[PDB]
């Protein structure tokens, strides 16, 4: 197979397909609420600039590497987005996934209208974003942590990106929820994520697809994802304001 | 103990600066080496040379293992070799594999000094191969085959230098106490002393 | 300018990590956080840090021996963990982490394979073992060890019954049983000077000016496993046995680590 | 640890060690042999010579001769190339080191802005080297010291440019070889030797002119006498 | 003292001011780093409001710019180089360079011979005058009293001591080599 | 929007790695292990001629070109 | 790096010989350079030297399940590749326009032309069945690389062995040399390739060019022709635009040229079969020219070793033993433990609020 | 299974001597600069060609003698039977397509662009028989449609040997049978060839009436192809004036 890993057995099926315990019930609750978060900027040591993002089930890492060699009049933005095996019910496969870049480039679609490549002529920008853990959204915490990371590597950008999720109850009286999670996100019948920038007012991405085909339902789900973005930037606030009075501090 | 057959032979292939086939016994290995050239401008180091190593196996492709064997061999042949002296210039050993019979490791770095020796390489000093294979009571055998191998519950092979007979390069098989590490280890410095004779007797007829 | 000033806290007896040259760094786990597999550790090692998660999945035996479970291990260097890897394939770097650790796993003899069949020549259980850097600040092959280690003792698997007439696999949820280890092996890494200088516990500074590495793993037992030389400057008898010396401490320390943290559950 | 003037003659071997007369003197270390402390070691295998001209005096250099193929760019050696390139005024030319020479368009003899000389891409120049340094491309120029091209120059238009190893260029360059005398006994003939490993020859007919180009490169080997004369004979036909 | 956040209100266009690392929309003054605040009065009052954060990990190059580098390699007609540290401080990375025949000294003359200028392995001090092409991207500059190599090295590994302007020597075996000395 | 206090595996990857007698012994450095310069000027000043300067004011001043 | 480059004096000196019909090294224009063959000790390993060419050629067979369909035949892997000793140019992906031709060619000579028979080579059907696969590698660039390579090919593959089986009723068991002796393969046919080479616009011809000759030239023709009268293949390329009368020339050419090679290669074999069952010395070993200063010979010898205990004792003994400050490990709350100096505090709290 | 009747003829319909009905259109595209657009009986093939123009890369790959012809090769996944979709990866792709190059570096008078390159596409949409001579045929109308000069029109036709008779223009049905096919690239006016390719075993005595039969089916297409470059040479002329 591969001539650059480890070759094991040629087939192998995961027990889940074999797993006796029928499908349980996810259960109710109320749609609005948000998941405590705990937000962490300047981990790494050896990175120009990182964050680890955490919040419920959720867990994921973002570093930023600074500007390197080599529209123009202008710096290129690589983008990279990559999740851990053991994340989920199955395992997946190392080299890659169409879903891993479907992901990549709706985040680089969202990142690049925050920062001012104006400012970077002939030079690049890689960002690198690790998930530990999917318990819930994920496109809202690739989103936010990457943007985190940016803001305390000393780039410059017009504000930041804040992301929120929604998923939508199968029952015969449907309802958009706040931040679903697994066990409200397989049993969902569509799902939205947004990016909205909290002072200027202006969605930096939209992603949503499924089976709610009303022109009305979609104005609440937008807007609901708008109230999240405004109420989780006073984390982000008090985070940006501990990382740097450690690190002004640590001189 | 004693070292099996022996045998090697010099300039086989006429595009190469230097060819060597060393064979020791059964198993046999195959070397060419290209002096000082170009180098890629995005490789190339300032006083210092760069050293590219690449093996060829004979059944299937190269993998995890045999870069991994290639590194070893990197790693040895740069600690005696005068790159200084040949800075912005590129040095690589080829190693190609023709027969396997057992202790191939000791035969391949055997090869390889043979290759840079007569390619006409500023070297510090000579390096040899040997490779040692305790059975499952602690007799010690010296240049094992693969039958003896199989049933052996541990195979040392180590890389001597020429000068006090230090140690270069480790690599080992079986797991093992570290009194017959030790008697291993003299054992090769021991064996060593008439390989080197073999080099010294190669190169004194090859002028004559 | 480099040498020189390195070897004025060397002289010094004080290398500026604030270390007395034969002390290693500060040393902590932390295991069952990931709950999406079947068992998981993370190991903090002053930096370097490495983090390592088991999968276990069915597959067929082989044909020479059905008999066996296979074992897939795998070291991956993400280009976030340092600044020097570029994205791509796998790099040399974590391909010989990677053999590195299958080497360990075969020689130490830590596992057998007789014990994850269910059934002979049919089905077996098949463990993959993925280990993803955070952070290299040198050492890599003693932390990704000492993940590995820490993270199979953790691993459990459920009870699999195969019916007669049905023919197929009812997997117990609910009683989980524990996986059978033999020995631990633990590894230790030196770094050796232009000729004869020996360091413990390196840093990819040093590593970026030494002249030479060397790693050397132990069992419960006194018993060498691998003796790791990739190259260099040379060394002697007197010190190896003045490496094995520290070697023994260290690998008392290590083992009375796995031995407290799995008593406290 | 043996001492020089003893082993004279004698195959040595990389990582050897040999003490030169004793008073530190400063004869230099030739390519094969490195000056550590008031000691020499040997880096390349071959054998010791020694070279004082008449006198008791300095007078004398260390250095071993082998048998190799790469050539290394040494200052002061006759050396054929190869033209590749005519990028901006210059003549970038292979020589079969690591890095190509550069000539200069006022290196012919009377060449000036105006009348320069006719070099196309793919031919053979004659030419001695001024810089060879490990600092720089080597660099060479063709027509003499003072001035007067001597034979120097674009040569080579009816013959044939084979490569033979340093060893038979080192033997054949000697002042008491008389291969080339009774080599062209048979075939008269004329030669450019190239210390590069290089060498142009040109017989009358097509026929010697294979027949030299064949039996030239196996005159390292076959030593004269109970052998050369018997060879010679058996190659008149 | 308080830090900043990359955008929020910080003064009016007519109390104040932007900076550097600032910009500003709508008649307000908007943060664009997440440095420290600091107003610099100066002299005539409206002081000019900018962020700063004071710990440069790295900085991009601008078209005038002092440098410290380090030579890689020497041509006949140009010299590539490493640009190694911005006026002061450190760099994490190293970038490219290239110095072509004009810069070497102040007069852009002929003559100037490459070769004896800047010989691989030392560490000089230039300026940027440009943002170059894809074959030389930055067009170092050393035409200069101040500027050219600083700190030079042996050719056996000792460090050199200026000796002239034109003209270098050994301290050890006392050997005579060229360079292009600059004022310390 | 109620911030939360951090777990173990959060705890523990963030920490901050920064004479008192002896001891890890055989690991000490003791254990395991003329110069006539005449030195010429040890800088060169450059109160001396610096050709670039001369060409440039020499011209300048001169201004004749004849 | 890249090959040395060509002068123009070379190709004028080559052209004016070939007008004159006389080459280099003395061959005149319908013949070839000697070949010289050489045999390994495990069955299906041969070198063949072509003039100044090499090719190691080995065959090895495993037993796999065969896809689905064609349930009773076997599959015949093969993977030329080009060495970067072989020359200065070869690169690990940096010639892949040459390795795809020089496949093909292999290819559709070996597998089209239906010499082998991998009708019997089946245990079971929908089953395991044995899986040959053929390796050949180029050592030594010389010119005509295809040449060299088939004889190699065919030599491997008309030395091979198998190993054999006992099948009945429906039950399997695999021999080994020693329960059971190795047995030979079926070769219906010997397809053999020839190459010709086309100078200043098709005036003249030179069979068996080397690799001067060969950039001297415009296109080449290939043409793979087995035993008796039956041609196999042929493939004109390079820049060649040819005549009608030429093919036929070039064809009764290659017959006479693979009637002779054939003649070589039945004696050579013949001759090693004869030496390997006589029951004198073979192999790899005993082919190195003693006539010759590069080559020598020592039997065995225990070198002496009678001293290594006492070395190894004194050597244990004479060191310093572990010490003895044991460290203690720290409990913070079931999960994470530290060892070393320590941290002050318990845990951070409220740190910065 | 018959292949050859008594009678004489074949599955289809059509004697030994005979080839299939062709309908060619030159012009189909507008955005490039050439185009054509072949049905060699029941094979659909299409080709796109690029002028001369400045090399891609600029990375010192030129020729300073003549210019740099690239030519490849894809397929649609629905181009037979079964799907069989393949990666862009594959060496049948790559060594027709050097085939191309080959012969259309010996056709083409490539010594008037020095340092240009020429950027050949060919796409089959429906692949039933030879599929070698479709595309050159496909490729030399749309080089033509290009206005690149060239000294003749290249046109390639196969042929075989089933009981003792030679076929021509053989289907994938005959292909797939175990046959000596054999395929040319001829140059009518002078009668040379630029490509010659064979497979399976076959007799060297029937060798030249194959040969023979091949070449004069492709003679027999050059006349067919040439009234519809004459056809549309004629409606362009009507079109000016």
């Given at each position: 197979?591969?001539?650059?890993?480890?070759?094991?057995?040629?087939?192998?099926?995961?027990?889940?397909?074999?797993?006796?315990?029928?499908?349980?019930?996810?259960?109710?609750?109320?749609?609005?609420?948000?998941?405590?978060?705990?937000?962490?900027?300047?981990?790494?040591?050896?990175?120009?600039?990182?964050?680890?993002?955490?919040?419920?089930?959720?867990?994921?890492?973002?570093?930023?590497?600074?500007?390197?060699?080599?529209?123009?009049?202008?710096?290129?933005?690589?983008?990279?987005?990559?999740?851990?095996?053991?994340?989920?019910?199955?395992?997946?496969?190392?080299?890659?996934?169409?879903?891993?870049?479907?992901?990549?480039?709706?985040?680089?679609?969202?990142?690049?209208?925050?920062?001012?490549?104006?400012?970077?002529?002939?030079?690049?920008?890689?960002?690198?974003?690790?998930?530990?853990?999917?318990?819930?959204?994920?496109?809202?915490?690739?989103?936010?942590?990457?943007?985190?990371?940016?803001?305390?590597?000393?780039?410059?950008?017009?504000?930041?990106?804040?992301?929120?999720?929604?998923?939508?109850?199968?029952?015969?009286?449907?309802?958009?929820?706040?931040?679903?999670?697994?066990?409200?996100?397989?049993?969902?019948?569509?799902?939205?994520?947004?990016?909205?920038?909290?002072?200027?007012?202006?969605?930096?991405?939209?992603?949503?697809?499924?089976?709610?085909?009303?022109?009305?339902?979609?104005?609440?789900?937008?807007?609901?994802?708008?109230?999240?973005?405004?109420?989780?930037?006073?984390?982000?606030?008090?985070?940006?304001?501990?990382?740097?009075?450690?690190?002004?501090?640590?001189? | 103990?004693?070292?099996?057959?022996?045998?090697?032979?010099?300039?086989?292939?006429?595009?190469?600066?230097?060819?060597?086939?060393?064979?020791?016994?059964?198993?046999?290995?195959?070397?060419?080496?290209?002096?000082?050239?170009?180098?890629?401008?995005?490789?190339?180091?300032?006083?210092?040379?760069?050293?590219?190593?690449?093996?060829?196996?004979?059944?299937?492709?190269?993998?995890?293992?045999?870069?991994?064997?290639?590194?070893?061999?990197?790693?040895?042949?740069?600690?005696?070799?005068?790159?200084?002296?040949?800075?912005?210039?590129?040095?690589?050993?080829?190693?190609?594999?023709?027969?396997?019979?057992?202790?191939?490791?000791?035969?391949?770095?055997?090869?390889?000094?043979?290759?840079?020796?007569?390619?006409?390489?500023?070297?510090?000093?000579?390096?040899?191969?040997?490779?040692?294979?305790?059975?499952?009571?602690?007799?010690?055998?010296?240049?094992?085959?693969?039958?003896?191998?199989?049933?052996?519950?541990?195979?040392?092979?180590?890389?001597?230098?020429?000068?006090?007979?230090?140690?270069?390069?480790?690599?080992?098989?079986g797991l093992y106490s570290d009194t017959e590490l030790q008697q291993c280890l003299?054992?090769?410095?021991?064996?060593?002393?008439?390989?080197?004779?073999?080099?010294?007797?190669?190169?004194?007829?090859?002028?004559? | 300018?480099?040498?020189?000033?390195?070897?004025?806290?060397?002289?010094?007896?004080?290398?500026?990590?604030?270390?007395?040259?034969?002390?290693?760094?500060?040393?902590?786990?932390?295991?069952?956080?990931?709950?999406?597999?079947?068992?998981?550790?993370?190991?903090?090692?002053?930096?370097?840090?490495?983090?390592?998660?088991?999968?276990?999945?069915?597959?067929?035996?082989?044909?020479?021996?059905?008999?066996?479970?296979?074992?897939?291990?795998?070291?991956?260097?993400?280009?976030?963990?340092?600044?020097?890897?570029?994205?791509?394939?796998?790099?040399?770097?974590?391909?010989?982490?990677?053999?590195?650790?299958?080497?360990?796993?075969?020689?130490?003899?830590?596992?057998?394979?007789?014990?994850?069949?269910?059934?002979?020549?049919?089905?077996?259980?098949?463990?993959?073992?993925?280990?993803?850097?955070?952070?290299?600040?040198?050492?890599?092959?003693?932390?990704?060890?000492?993940?590995?280690?820490?993270?199979?003792?953790?691993?459990?698997?459920?009870?699999?019954?195969?019916?007669?007439?049905?023919?197929?696999?009812?997997?117990?949820?609910?009683?989980?049983?524990?996986?059978?280890?033999?020995?631990?092996?633990?590894?230790?890494?030196?770094?050796?000077?232009?000729?004869?200088?020996?360091?413990?516990?390196?840093?990819?500074?040093?590593?970026?000016?030494?002249?030479?590495?060397?790693?050397?793993?132990?069992?419960?037992?006194?018993?060498?496993?691998?003796?790791?030389?990739?190259?260099?400057?040379?060394?002697?008898?007197?010190?190896?046995?003045?490496?094995?010396?520290?070697?023994?401490?260290?690998?008392?320390?290590?083992?009375?680590?796995?031995?407290?943290?799995?008593?406290?559950? | 640890?043996?001492?020089?003037?003893?082993?004279?003659?004698?195959?040595?071997?990389?990582?050897?060690?040999?003490?030169?007369?004793?008073?530190?003197?400063?004869?230099?270390?030739?390519?094969?042999?490195?000056?550590?402390?008031?000691?020499?070691?040997?880096?390349?295998?071959?054998?010791?010579?020694?070279?004082?001209?008449?006198?008791?005096?300095?007078?004398?250099?260390?250095?071993?001769?082998?048998?190799?193929?790469?050539?290394?760019?040494?200052?002061?050696?006759?050396?054929?190339?190869?033209?590749?390139?005519?990028?901006?005024?210059?003549?970038?030319?292979?020589?079969?080191?690591?890095?190509?020479?550069?000539?200069?368009?006022?290196?012919?003899?009377?060449?000036?802005?105006?009348?320069?000389?006719?070099?196309?891409?793919?031919?053979?120049?004659?030419?001695?080297?001024?810089?060879?340094?490990?600092?720089?491309?080597?660099?060479?120029?063709?027509?003499?010291?003072?001035?007067?091209?001597?034979?120097?120059?674009?040569?080579?238009?009816?013959?044939?440019?084979?490569?033979?190893?340093?060893?038979?260029?080192?033997?054949?360059?000697?002042?008491?070889?008389?291969?080339?005398?009774?080599?062209?006994?048979?075939?008269?003939?004329?030669?450019?030797?190239?210390?590069?490993?290089?060498?142009?020859?040109?017989?009358?007919?097509?026929?010697?002119?294979?027949?030299?180009?064949?039996?030239?490169?196996?005159?390292?080997?076959?030593?004269?006498?109970?052998?050369?004369?018997?060879?010679?004979?058996?190659?008149?036909? | 003292?308080?830090?900043?956040?990359?955008?929020?209100?910080?003064?009016?266009?007519?109390?104040?001011?932007?900076?550097?690392?600032?910009?500003?929309?709508?008649?307000?003054?908007?943060?664009?780093?997440?440095?420290?605040?600091?107003?610099?009065?100066?002299?005539?009052?409206?002081?000019?409001?900018?962020?700063?954060?004071?710990?440069?990990?790295?900085?991009?190059?601008?078209?005038?710019?002092?440098?410290?580098?380090?030579?890689?390699?020497?041509?006949?007609?140009?010299?590539?180089?490493?640009?190694?540290?911005?006026?002061?401080?450190?760099?994490?990375?190293?970038?490219?360079?290239?110095?072509?025949?004009?810069?070497?000294?102040?007069?852009?003359?002929?003559?100037?011979?490459?070769?004896?200028?800047?010989?691989?392995?030392?560490?000089?001090?230039?300026?940027?005058?440009?943002?170059?092409?894809?074959?030389?991207?930055?067009?170092?500059?050393?035409?200069?009293?101040?500027?050219?190599?600083?700190?030079?090295?042996?050719?056996?590994?000792?460090?050199?001591?200026?000796?002239?302007?034109?003209?270098?020597?050994?301290?050890?075996?006392?050997?005579?080599?060229?360079?292009?000395?600059?004022?310390? | 929007?109620?911030?939360?206090?951090?777990?173990?595996?959060?705890?523990?990857?963030?920490?901050?790695?920064?004479?008192?007698?002896?001891?890890?012994?055989?690991?000490?450095?003791?254990?395991?292990?003329?110069?006539?310069?005449?030195?010429?000027?040890?800088?060169?000043?450059?109160?001396?001629?610096?050709?670039?300067?001369?060409?440039?004011?020499?011209?300048?001043?001169?201004?004749?070109?004849? | 790096?890249?090959?040395?480059?060509?002068?123009?004096?070379?190709?004028?000196?080559?052209?004016?010989?070939?007008?004159?019909?006389?080459?280099?090294?003395?061959?005149?224009?319908?013949?070839?350079?000697?070949?010289?063959?050489?045999?390994?000790?495990?069955?299906?390993?041969?070198?063949?030297?072509?003039?100044?060419?090499?090719?190691?050629?080995?065959?090895?067979?495993?037993?796999?399940?065969?896809?689905?369909?064609?349930?009773?035949?076997?599959?015949?892997?093969?993977?030329?590749?080009?060495?970067?000793?072989?020359?200065?140019?070869?690169?690990?992906?940096?010639?892949?326009?040459?390795?795809?031709?020089?496949?093909?060619?292999?290819?559709?000579?070996?597998?089209?032309?239906?010499?082998?028979?991998?009708?019997?080579?089946?245990?079971?059907?929908?089953?395991?069945?044995?899986?040959?696969?053929?390796?050949?590698?180029?050592?030594?660039?010389?010119?005509?690389?295809?040449?060299?390579?088939?004889?190699?090919?065919?030599?491997?593959?008309?030395?091979?062995?198998?190993?054999?089986?006992?099948?009945?009723?429906?039950?399997?068991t695999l021999y080994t040399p020693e329960e059971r002796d190795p047995v030979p393969?079926?070769?219906?046919?010997?397809?053999?390739?020839?190459?010709?080479?086309?100078?200043?616009?098709?005036?003249?011809?030179?069979?068996?060019?080397?690799?001067?000759?060969?950039?001297?030239?415009?296109?080449?023709?290939?043409?793979?022709?087995?035993?008796?009268?039956?041609?196999?293949?042929?493939?004109?390329?390079?820049?060649?635009?040819?005549?009608?009368?030429?093919?036929?020339?070039?064809?009764?050419?290659?017959?006479?040229?693979?009637?002779?090679?054939?003649?070589?290669?039945?004696?050579?074999?013949?001759?090693?079969?004869?030496?390997?069952?006589?029951?004198?010395?073979?192999?790899?070993?005993?082919?190195?020219?003693?006539?010759?200063?590069?080559?020598?010979?020592?039997?065995?010898?225990?070198?002496?070793?009678?001293?290594?205990?006492?070395?190894?004792?004194?050597?244990?003994?004479?060191?310093?033993?572990?010490?003895?400050?044991?460290?203690?490990?720290?409990?913070?709350?079931?999960?994470?433990?530290?060892?070393?100096?320590?941290?002050?505090?318990?845990?951070?709290?409220?740190?910065?609020? | 299974?018959?292949?050859?009747?008594?009678?004489?003829?074949?599955?289809?319909?059509?004697?030994?001597?005979?080839?299939?009905?062709?309908?060619?259109?030159?012009?189909?595209?507008?955005?490039?600069?050439?185009?054509?657009?072949?049905?060699?009986?029941?094979?659909?093939?299409?080709?796109?060609?690029?002028?001369?123009?400045?090399?891609?890369?600029?990375?010192?790959?030129?020729?300073?003698?003549?210019?740099?012809?690239?030519?490849?090769?894809?397929?649609?996944?629905?181009?037979?039977?079964?799907?069989?979709?393949?990666?862009?990866?594959?060496?049948?792709?790559?060594?027709?397509?050097?085939?191309?190059?080959?012969?259309?570096?010996?056709?083409?008078?490539?010594?008037?662009?020095?340092?240009?390159?020429?950027?050949?596409?060919?796409?089959?949409?429906?692949?039933?028989?030879?599929?070698?001579?479709?595309?050159?045929?496909?490729?030399?109308?749309?080089?033509?449609?290009?206005?690149?000069?060239?000294?003749?029109?290249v046109c390639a036709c196969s042929a075989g040997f089933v009981d003792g008779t030679?076929?021509?223009?053989?289907?994938?049905?005959?292909?797939?049978?175990?046959?000596?096919?054999?395929?040319?690239?001829?140059?009518?006016?002078?009668?040379?060839?630029?490509?010659?390719?064979?497979?399976?075993?076959?007799?060297?005595?029937?060798?030249?009436?194959?040969?023979?039969?091949?070449?004069?089916?492709?003679?027999?297409?050059?006349?067919?192809?040439?009234?519809?470059?004459?056809?549309?040479?004629?409606?362009?002329?009507?079109?000016?004036?």
């Open positions: 197979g591969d001539h650059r890993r480890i070759r094991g057995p040629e087939e192998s099926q995961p027990p889940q397909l074999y797993a006796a315990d029928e499908e349980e019930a996810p259960g109710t609750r109320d749609p609005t609420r948000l998941r405590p978060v705990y937000a962490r900027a300047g981990l790494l040591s050896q990175a120009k600039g990182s964050a680890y993002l955490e919040a419920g089930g959720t867990k994921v890492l973002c570093a930023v590497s600074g500007p390197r060699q080599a529209a123009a009049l202008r710096g290129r933005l690589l983008c990279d987005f990559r999740r851990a095996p053991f994340a989920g019910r199955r395992r997946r496969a190392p080299p890659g996934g169409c879903e891993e870049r479907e992901l990549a480039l709706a985040l680089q679609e969202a990142l690049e209208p925050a920062v001012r490549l104006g400012r970077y002529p002939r030079a690049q920008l890689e960002v690198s974003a690790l998930l530990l853990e999917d318990g819930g959204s994920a496109l809202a915490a690739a989103l936010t942590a990457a943007a985190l990371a940016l803001a305390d590597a000393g780039v410059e950008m017009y504000d930041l990106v804040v992301g929120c999720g929604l998923s939508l109850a199968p029952g015969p009286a449907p309802t958009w929820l706040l931040d679903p999670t697994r066990l409200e996100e397989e049993r969902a019948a569509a799902g939205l994520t947004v990016a909205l920038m909290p002072v200027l007012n202006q969605v930096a991405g939209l992603l949503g697809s499924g089976e709610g085909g009303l022109t009305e339902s979609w104005a609440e789900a937008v807007r609901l994802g708008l109230e999240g973005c405004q109420r989780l930037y006073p984390v982000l606030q008090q985070s940006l304001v501990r990382a740097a009075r450690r690190r002004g501090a640590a001189a | 103990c004693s070292l099996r057959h022996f045998a090697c032979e010099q300039n086989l292939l006429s595009r190469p600066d230097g060819s060597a086939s060393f064979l020791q016994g059964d198993t046999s290995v195959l070397a060419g080496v290209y002096g000082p050239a170009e180098v890629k401008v995005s490789k190339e180091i300032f006083n210092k040379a760069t050293l590219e190593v690449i093996l060829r196996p004979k059944i299937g492709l190269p993998g995890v293992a045999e870069k991994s064997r290639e590194r070893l061999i990197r790693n040895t042949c740069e600690a005696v070799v005068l790159g200084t002296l040949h800075p912005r210039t590129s040095i690589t050993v080829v190693l190609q594999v023709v027969s396997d019979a057992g202790s191939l490791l000791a035969c391949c770095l055997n090869a390889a000094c043979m290759a840079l020796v007569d390619a006409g390489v500023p070297m510090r000093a000579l390096f040899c191969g040997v490779a040692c294979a305790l059975d499952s009571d602690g007799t010690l055998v010296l240049d094992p085959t693969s039958k003896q191998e199989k049933e052996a519950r541990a195979v040392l092979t180590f890389a001597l230098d020429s000068v006090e007979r230090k140690l270069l390069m480790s690599s080992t098989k003299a054992a090769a410095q021991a064996a060593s002393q008439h390989v080197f004779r073999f080099y010294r007797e190669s190169l004194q007829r090859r002028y004559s | 300018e480099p040498l020189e000033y390195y070897r004025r806290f060397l002289k010094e007896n004080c290398r500026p990590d604030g270390r007395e040259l034969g002390e290693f760094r500060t040393t902590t786990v932390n295991i069952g956080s990931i709950s999406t597999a079947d068992g998981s550790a993370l190991v903090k090692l002053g930096n370097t840090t490495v983090i390592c998660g088991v999968k276990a999945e069915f597959a067929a035996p082989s044909t020479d021996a059905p008999d066996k479970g296979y074992v897939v291990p795998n070291v991956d260097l993400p280009p976030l963990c340092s600044s020097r890897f570029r994205s791509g394939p796998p790099g040399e770097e974590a391909q010989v982490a990677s053999q590195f650790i299958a080497d360990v796993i075969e020689n130490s003899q830590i596992i057998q394979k007789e014990d994850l069949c269910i059934s002979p020549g049919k089905l077996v259980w098949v463990l993959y073992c993925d280990l993803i850097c955070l952070d290299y600040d040198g050492n890599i092959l003693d932390a990704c060890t000492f993940a590995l280690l820490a993270a199979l003792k953790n691993v459990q698997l459920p009870e699999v019954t195969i019916n007669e007439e049905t023919a197929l696999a009812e997997v117990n949820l609910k009683k989980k049983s524990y996986l059978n280890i033999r020995t631990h092996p633990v590894a230790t890494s030196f770094a050796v000077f232009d000729d004869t200088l020996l360091i413990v516990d390196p840093t990819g500074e040093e590593e970026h000016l030494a002249t030479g590495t060397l790693t050397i793993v132990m069992d419960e037992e006194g018993k060498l496993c691998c003796l790791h030389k990739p190259g260099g400057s040379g060394l002697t008898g007197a010190k190896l046995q003045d490496c094995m010396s520290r070697a023994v401490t260290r690998h008392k320390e290590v083992k009375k680590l796995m031995d407290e943290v799995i008593k406290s559950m | 640890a043996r001492a020089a003037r003893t082993v004279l003659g004698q195959v040595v071997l990389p990582g050897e060690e040999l003490l030169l007369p004793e008073s530190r003197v400063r004869v230099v270390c030739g390519p094969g042999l490195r000056r550590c402390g008031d000691r020499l070691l040997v880096t390349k295998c071959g054998r010791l010579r020694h070279k004082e001209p008449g006198s008791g005096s300095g007078g004398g250099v260390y250095w071993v001769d082998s048998q190799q193929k790469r050539y290394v760019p040494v200052k002061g050696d006759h050396v054929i190339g190869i033209v590749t390139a005519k990028s901006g005024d210059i003549f970038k030319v292979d020589v079969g080191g690591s890095e190509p020479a550069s000539l200069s368009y006022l290196s012919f003899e009377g060449a000036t802005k105006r009348n320069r000389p006719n070099v196309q891409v793919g031919d053979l120049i004659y030419g001695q080297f001024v810089v060879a340094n490990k600092d720089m491309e080597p660099e060479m120029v063709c027509i003499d010291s003072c001035g007067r091209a001597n034979g120097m120059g674009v040569i080579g238009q009816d013959g044939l440019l084979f490569k033979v190893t340093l060893g038979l260029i080192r033997k054949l360059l000697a002042p008491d070889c008389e291969i080339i005398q009774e080599v062209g006994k048979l075939h008269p003939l004329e030669i450019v030797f190239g210390m590069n490993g290089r060498i142009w020859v040109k017989a009358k007919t097509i026929q010697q002119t294979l027949i030299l180009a064949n039996i030239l490169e196996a005159c390292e080997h076959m030593t004269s006498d109970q052998r050369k004369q018997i060879f010679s004979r058996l190659a008149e036909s | 003292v308080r830090y900043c956040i990359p955008g929020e209100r910080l003064c009016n266009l007519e109390e104040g001011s932007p900076g550097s690392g600032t910009y500003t929309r709508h008649g307000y003054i908007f943060s664009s780093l997440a440095g420290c605040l600091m107003k610099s009065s100066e002299n005539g009052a409206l002081p000019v409001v900018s962020v700063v954060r004071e710990t440069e990990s790295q900085l991009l190059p601008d078209v005038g710019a002092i440098v410290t580098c380090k030579v890689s390699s020497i041509n006949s007609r140009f010299a590539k180089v490493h640009i190694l540290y911005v006026g002061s401080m450190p760099l994490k990375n190293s970038f490219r360079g290239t110095i072509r025949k004009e810069d070497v000294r102040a007069t852009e003359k002929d003559k100037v011979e490459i070769y004896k200028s800047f010989r691989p392995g030392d560490i000089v001090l230039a300026k940027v005058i440009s943002l170059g092409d894809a074959q030389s991207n930055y067009l170092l500059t050393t035409a200069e009293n101040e500027l050219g190599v600083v700190v030079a090295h042996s050719e056996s590994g000792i460090q050199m001591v200026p000796i002239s302007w034109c003209e270098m020597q050994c301290p050890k075996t006392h050997t005579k080599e060229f360079r292009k000395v600059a004022r310390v | 929007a109620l911030a939360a206090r951090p777990s173990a595996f959060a705890s523990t990857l963030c920490l901050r790695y920064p004479r008192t007698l002896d001891l890890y012994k055989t690991f000490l450095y003791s254990r395991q292990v003329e110069i006539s310069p005449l030195v010429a000027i040890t800088p060169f000043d450059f109160k001396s001629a610096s050709p670039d300067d001369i060409v440039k004011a020499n011209q300048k001043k001169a201004f004749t070109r004849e | 790096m890249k090959e040395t480059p060509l002068s123009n004096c070379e190709r004028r000196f080559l052209l004016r010989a070939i007008e004159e019909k006389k080459r280099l090294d003395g061959r005149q224009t319908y013949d070839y350079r000697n070949i010289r063959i050489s045999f390994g000790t495990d069955y299906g390993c041969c070198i063949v030297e072509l003039g100044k060419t090499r090719v190691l050629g080995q065959v090895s067979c495993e037993l796999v399940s065969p896809k689905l369909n064609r349930a009773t035949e076997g599959i015949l892997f093969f993977n030329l590749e080009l060495s970067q000793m072989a020359a200065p140019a070869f690169e690990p992906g940096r010639q892949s326009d040459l390795l795809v031709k020089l496949n093909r060619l292999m290819e559709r000579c070996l597998r089209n032309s239906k010499c082998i028979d991998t009708e019997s080579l089946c245990v079971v059907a929908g089953e395991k069945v044995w899986q040959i696969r053929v390796d050949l590698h180029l050592l030594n660039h010389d010119g005509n690389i295809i040449d060299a390579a088939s004889i190699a090919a065919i030599v491997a593959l008309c030395h091979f062995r198998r190993p054999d089986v006992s099948v009945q009723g429906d039950e399997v393969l079926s070769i219906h046919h010997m397809p053999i390739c020839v190459s010709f080479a086309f100078f200043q616009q098709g005036t003249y011809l030179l069979v068996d060019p080397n690799e001067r000759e060969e950039r001297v030239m415009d296109g080449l023709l290939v043409i793979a022709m087995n035993k008796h009268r039956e041609i196999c293949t042929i493939q004109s390329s390079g820049g060649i635009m040819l005549l009608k009368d030429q093919v036929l020339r070039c064809s009764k050419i290659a017959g006479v040229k693979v009637a002779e090679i054939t003649e070589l290669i039945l004696k050579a074999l013949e001759n090693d079969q004869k030496v390997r069952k006589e029951g004198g010395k073979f192999g790899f070993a005993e082919s190195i020219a003693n006539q010759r200063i590069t080559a020598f010979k020592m039997e065995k010898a225990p070198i002496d070793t009678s001293d290594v205990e006492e070395k190894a004792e004194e050597i244990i003994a004479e060191a310093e033993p572990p010490s003895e400050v044991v460290s203690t490990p720290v409990l913070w709350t079931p999960g994470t433990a530290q060892i070393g100096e320590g941290v002050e505090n318990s845990w951070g709290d409220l740190e910065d609020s | 299974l018959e292949l050859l009747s008594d009678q004489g003829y074949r599955v289809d319909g059509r004697r030994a001597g005979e080839l299939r009905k062709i309908q060619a259109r030159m012009g189909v595209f507008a955005q490039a600069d050439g185009s054509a657009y072949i049905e060699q009986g029941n094979t659909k093939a299409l080709a796109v060609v690029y002028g001369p123009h400045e090399i891609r890369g600029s990375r010192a790959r030129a020729l300073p003698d003549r210019a740099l012809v690239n030519c490849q090769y894809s397929s649609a996944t629905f181009s037979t039977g079964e799907r069989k979709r393949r990666p862009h990866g594959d060496r049948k792709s790559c060594e027709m397509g050097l085939q191309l190059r080959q012969t259309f570096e010996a056709a083409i008078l490539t010594q008037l662009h020095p340092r240009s390159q020429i950027d050949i596409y060919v796409q089959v949409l429906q692949a039933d028989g030879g599929t070698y001579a479709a595309c050159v045929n496909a490729a030399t109308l749309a080089v033509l449609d290009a206005g690149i000069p060239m000294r003749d029109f030679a076929l021509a223009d053989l289907s994938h049905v005959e292909e797939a049978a175990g046959g000596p096919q054999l395929a040319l690239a001829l140059l009518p006016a002078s009668g040379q060839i630029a490509l010659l390719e064979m497979d399976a075993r076959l007799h060297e005595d029937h060798l030249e009436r194959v040969l023979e039969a091949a070449a004069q089916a492709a003679r027999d297409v050059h006349t067919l192809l040439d009234r519809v470059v004459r056809q549309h040479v004629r409606e362009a002329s009507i079109l000016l004036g």
